[PDB]
Design a protein around this ligand. Sequence first.
Ligand SMILES: *[C@@H]1O[C@H](CO)[C@@H](O[C@@H]2O[C@H](CO)[C@@H](O[C@@H]3O[C@H](CO[C@H]4O[C@H](CO)[C@@H](O)[C@H](O)[C@@H]4O)[C@@H](O)[C@H](O)[C@@H]3O)[C@H](O)[C@H]2NC(C)=O)[C@H](O)[C@H]1NC(C)=O
Ligand SMILES: *[C@@H]1O[C@H](CO)[C@@H](O[C@@H]2O[C@H](CO)[C@@H](O[C@@H]3O[C@H](CO)[C@@H](O)[C@H](O)[C@@H]3O)[C@H](O)[C@H]2NC(C)=O)[C@H](O)[C@H]1NC(C)=O
Ligand code: KFR
Ligand SMILES: *[C@@H]1O[C@H](CO)[C@@H](O[C@@H]2O[C@H](CO)[C@@H](O)[C@H](O)[C@H]2NC(C)=O)[C@H](O)[C@H]1NC(C)=O
Ligand SMILES: *[C@@H]1O[C@H](CO)[C@@H](O[C@@H]2O[C@H](CO)[C@@H](O)[C@H](O)[C@H]2NC(C)=O)[C@H](O)[C@H]1NC(C)=O
Ligand SMILES: *[C@@H]1O[C@H](CO)[C@@H](O[C@@H]2O[C@H](CO)[C@@H](O)[C@H](O)[C@H]2NC(C)=O)[C@H](O)[C@H]1NC(C)=O
Ligand code: NAG
Ligand code: NAG
Ligand code: NAG
Ligand code: NAG
Ligand code: ZN
Length: 852
Amino acid sequence: GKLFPWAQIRLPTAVVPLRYELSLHPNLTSMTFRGSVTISVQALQVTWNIILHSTGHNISRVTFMSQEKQAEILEYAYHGQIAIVAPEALLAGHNYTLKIEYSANISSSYYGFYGFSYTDESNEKKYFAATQFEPLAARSAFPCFDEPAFKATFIIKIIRDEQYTALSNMPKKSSVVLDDGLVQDEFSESVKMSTYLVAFIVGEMKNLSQDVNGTLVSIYAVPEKIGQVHYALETTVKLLEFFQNYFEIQYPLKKLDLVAIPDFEAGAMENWGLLTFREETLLYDSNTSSMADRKLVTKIIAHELAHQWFGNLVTMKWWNDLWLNEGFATFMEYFSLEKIFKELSSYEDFLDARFKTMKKDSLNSSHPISSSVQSSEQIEEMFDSLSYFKGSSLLLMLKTYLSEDVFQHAVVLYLHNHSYASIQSDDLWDSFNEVTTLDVKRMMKTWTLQKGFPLVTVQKKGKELFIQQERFFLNSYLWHIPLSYVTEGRNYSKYQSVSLLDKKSGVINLTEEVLWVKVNINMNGYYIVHYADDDWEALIHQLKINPYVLSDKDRANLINNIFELAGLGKVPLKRAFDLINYLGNENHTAPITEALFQTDLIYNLLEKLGYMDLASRLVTRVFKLLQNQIQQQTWTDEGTPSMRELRSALLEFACTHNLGNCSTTAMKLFDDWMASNGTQSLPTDVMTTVFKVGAKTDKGWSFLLGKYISIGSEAEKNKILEALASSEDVRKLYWLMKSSLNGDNFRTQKLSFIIRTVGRHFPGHLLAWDFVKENWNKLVQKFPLGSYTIQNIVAGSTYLFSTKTHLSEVQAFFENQSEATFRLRCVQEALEVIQLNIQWMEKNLKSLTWWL
Ligand SMILES: *[C@@H]1O[C@H](CO)[C@@H](O[C@@H]2O[C@H](CO)[C@@H](O[C@@H]3O[C@H](CO[C@H]4O[C@H](CO)[C@@H](O)[C@H](O)[C@@H]4O)[C@@H](O)[C@H](O)[C@@H]3O)[C@H](O)[C@H]2NC(C)=O)[C@H](O)[C@H]1NC(C)=O
Ligand SMILES: *[C@@H]1O[C@H](CO)[C@@H](O[C@@H]2O[C@H](CO)[C@@H](O[C@@H]3O[C@H](CO)[C@@H](O)[C@H](O)[C@@H]3O)[C@H](O)[C@H]2NC(C)=O)[C@H](O)[C@H]1NC(C)=O
Ligand SMILES: COC(=O)[C@H](Cc1c[nH]c2ccccc12)NC(=O)[C@H](CC(C)C)NC(=O)[C@@H](O)[C@H](N)COc1ccc(O)cc1
Ligand SMILES: *[C@@H]1O[C@H](CO)[C@@H](O[C@@H]2O[C@H](CO)[C@@H](O)[C@H](O)[C@H]2NC(C)=O)[C@H](O)[C@H]1NC(C)=O
Ligand SMILES: *[C@@H]1O[C@H](CO)[C@@H](O[C@@H]2O[C@H](CO)[C@@H](O)[C@H](O)[C@H]2NC(C)=O)[C@H](O)[C@H]1NC(C)=O
Ligand SMILES: *[C@@H]1O[C@H](CO)[C@@H](O[C@@H]2O[C@H](CO)[C@@H](O)[C@H](O)[C@H]2NC(C)=O)[C@H](O)[C@H]1NC(C)=O
Ligand SMILES: *[C@@H]1O[C@H](CO)[C@@H](O)[C@H](O)[C@H]1NC(C)=O
Ligand SMILES: *[C@@H]1O[C@H](CO)[C@@H](O)[C@H](O)[C@H]1NC(C)=O
Ligand SMILES: *[C@@H]1O[C@H](CO)[C@@H](O)[C@H](O)[C@H]1NC(C)=O
Ligand SMILES: *[C@@H]1O[C@H](CO)[C@@H](O)[C@H](O)[C@H]1NC(C)=O
Ligand SMILES: [Zn+2]
């Protein structure tokens, strides 16, 4: 009771961790554990108190090791900090060794060292423990310096029962039977790393493996699935051979372990050496899995294997620069997939994700990509689309402005100079300046330190393009925007070129008279282009004549930007429906999915406001544009991957709004699969549509719930859950959320997926927002504040409100909560989403009733 000696969230810099040794004896029978942390520290200045991070620990002994003395420990729970009062002052340059012995519980949630139970194929209950330490949960398990810049080497010693296999970051040195009959395994010392990338797993698993030039790649899973792990190994082996070639640095360890965990809230984690996953994101079966499920296992493996360089070998100094980890990993994920997995058309997801990140970055709720964070909530809210898909778009803009070979050299320089060290945003731009003349550092200062993105307005007047730049915002700093443009002349000849606008306005000369100009080729740039109308009509005439003279990316780029500029008010909504009246000649996915998104959004807003005959007049006119392409659809799994994704988009659009005979066809496919008893093989491209039509009946909804609790595909289960949660019976909708929240028949990791599916359609719109409000603090006690789960639920329960009544309701609810809860950007964003729904409906409702 001597006054905690530190009042700042961030630890002192006086003492640095040098070496860590943590031995743990978890039970999982008792769901408690006992741990011993021995930390080698260096004092860089005179010190009287070691300030450490510790959350949820009963300490029995703290000690120093010429004399072995006991130390006093104090605790300031608010900041999750413990202070160790030194017996004699610590001096600079002097190494010391502290040992803390403590007890704690295994956790209730998916964060920290956590445990769960699963029933086997034999009705056998088997236990499992695992770790999720990013962002700030390693202080739950071992007293540590829980800040990423305090890199160190780690020695894990885990005591286990013989039936379990204990995995960790490093390979096992050896395992000895102790006098208790229990085994204590020990792992080789680690590379210099962050505490959040530490990981240990305890559970009954099996493995399939292959050696790549000294590294044994191992994919684990619980034994009833080990045949379901072949696609992951080969993809891991192939993507491993790709990343060690492009980055020209090798995976430094001898084990690349990928584990499929039954209860995990995120899709995956990059824990060095031990990559954790969700069983749905790593396993795959040719017979029960979509192309979209295969297009996620290859994606998620590429994302976390690129974190082994971008995030583990090179790590950010503070969470303000999380985009240097997650934005590089997203970039390298889609870069890998365009080179060695091209036929999956992974660019369509990357393109679609950028459309959605730009809508959120257009709001005043947005922030600079690298902006200061201090609280735990702010650190948890950095795991957002901006850090992932705006960082991956800054890099895609720089790779396409510079050569693809100059980009590679900045990567090789930056990974070598900063290996096993911390980095900030300006360290990367310096690596671009050494391989280039160009001041990449000032070119990227406005894309990193200002919020939003620019709007390039474009006018063709003779043989010159006039270009001006503005911030894309509705109620000053300029950007060094690399412009690209393609143009066609008197002849079908198409010319591509590039420029850099660093001033408010500019002029480009064209050495020919042109038929039309298209700026931002394939949207390699993070900006929206608005044209003058004589230049917009040129692009709309061409679309109505032969749209295939433009790329798939460029035609989805125009659909997105035209509906986006129709909200800010720069264009009339009639103009965006003018454009998409060309879709009678479109049969490629990306433009169709994007037109279907905008159509479905306007339909989902109008329905809630009671305009049901206006909403159904919109879905049938879009159905009439796409009617030829929908009726040629086969209820099979035939075609290329992108043609398979288009098959499910067109049949889900048709069946969700009861258009055509499609629901009659899906109901027959369901009624045969049900008479089978779940036996008849269904094409994986029509399963969700089939299950959704069957779930609208009490027989099919009840049959489908019996398959949920009995089938072993966690991706066909995710397809049945969408059908169940798309019921029109609000008592069934309500019972699905209440069970996921409590963990009974649906795991709590699907609650956000349920709340999302429920709140999107008319029957459960109010039920979902009410359940979130009423159970708000149960959700905050399972998913940390600012987490992706909490951000996904706030956005998807509120984004379809469009009345001043709902704006004050949502605002007043969050004001009744903590200031930290109110100041979440996901909350401020949700409010702004609502405000823009009100304005869009006053501007474009009397005329949209005219066009329709
Ligand atoms: C942690 O401390 C524990 C002490 O509480 C130690 O745990 C005990 O270890 C024994 C044997 O090592 C286990 O004995 C077996 O457990 C099963 C329970 O599950 C099985 O049966 C049910 C019922 O059908 C079934 O659903 C399951 O699938 C299993 O088949 C017993 O039924 C068996 O007969 C057998 O006794 C204990 O379960 C376990 N706990 C307790 C409370 O007894 C543990 O070794 C310590 N671990 C470490 C790392 O130190
Ligand atoms: C439709 O399919 C489900 C499963 O997909 C069938 O339920 C299964 O019924 C069999 C009956 O032999 C059960 O197998 C045996 O269960 C008994 C009782 O537990 C046990 O003594 C044996 O060890 C053996 O496992 C099986 O457990 C059960 N599975 C489930 C998930 O319920 C159902 O009977 C089928 N119905 C029709 C009409 O085809
Ligand atoms: C299809 O499902 C998903 O789209 C989920 C969404 C999601 C659920 N939960 C999240 C939490 C944070 C961030 C995103 C999520 N995508 C992921 O999970 C991604 C893998 C993708 C990029 C292929 N994962 C990564 O990018 C990893 O590298 C982080 N470092 C994970 O960070 C964590 C921080 C706090 C946590 O509690 C758990 C993880
Ligand atoms: C599961 O993992 C084990 C251990 O990594 C694999 O067995 C090892 O295989 C390597 C490969 O050459 C050998 O160097 C070791 O001597 C083996 N160790 C033991 C204890 O057998 C095993 O092959 C993996 N399972 C499968 C199906 O591949
Ligand atoms: C095969 O193993 C060798 C040996 O590690 C790898 O050679 C490395 O190549 C990278 C390429 O830049 C060098 O930076 C490393 O220094 C090399 N290692 C050594 C020890 O010299 C090679 O990449 C491996 N190939 C595969 C496919 O895994
Ligand atoms: C198709 O029209 C394009 C539009 O310019 C023509 O491109 C020009 O070709 C001449 C050579 O005949 C060059 O001197 C010009 O510089 C080209 N244009 C530009 C903008 O540089 C192309 O010649 C036409 N195709 C033919 C004639 O086959
Ligand atoms: C462990 O669990 C107990 C009871 O479940 C709880 O009261 C306590 O705060 C937890 N933490 C520690 C350090 O024991
Ligand atoms: C601390 O350890 C480092 C690494 O071995 C060594 O260079 C240094 O001399 C040590 N200092 C003391 C006081 O032990
Ligand atoms: C926009 O955000 C700023 C701070 O980023 C805030 O001061 C202001 O109130 C917000 N609203 C408007 C309309 O600018
Ligand atoms: C459903 O409509 C499509 C559209 O032309 C047609 O090809 C198909 O034969 C129809 N099937 C039934 C059962 O009416
Ligand atoms: Zn990541």
